[PDB]
Amino acid sequence: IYIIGISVSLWIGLTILGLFLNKAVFFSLFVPSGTPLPLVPVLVLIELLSYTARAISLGLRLAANTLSGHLLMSILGNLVKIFGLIPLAGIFAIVILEFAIACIQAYVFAILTSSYLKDSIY
């Protein structure tokens, strides 16, 4: 699941960069705020470079959720050796936060794609 998540996220990042480059062949380009200054081409850490960082951050949700569930093996040996009822409440809160993180990660990926489509048509 970890290797399939990084491979699926890399294909979505290449499609976002290819769609923005195809629209620049008939609607100018620029994409730079000018305010009586220069050195705007050196800070090209967005658009093309931003797709690589957004794909690794969105694809890491599958690996982070598996790390929380795999951490119960270290707490299972100590609870079967204070009362052990504190581990049940902590595992229930981490499972609810991991399931709710999938909806927040899906909304963050759709919000990032809306900025690329709106800037390519302006």
Partner: protein, 51 residues
Amino acid sequence: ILLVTFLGFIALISKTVAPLYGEMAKNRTDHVVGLLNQARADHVNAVKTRI
């Protein structure tokens, strides 16, 4: 954690069942009330035009 997740999701699905039926009343049940009000207004307009 498997038994705690099944018990917590059972209580959340029970409260969501009442919320889904109540939220559907403003769209599904509201369509029947809107169609009945439109049919009553069309019947009064047809009776006034026939008179």
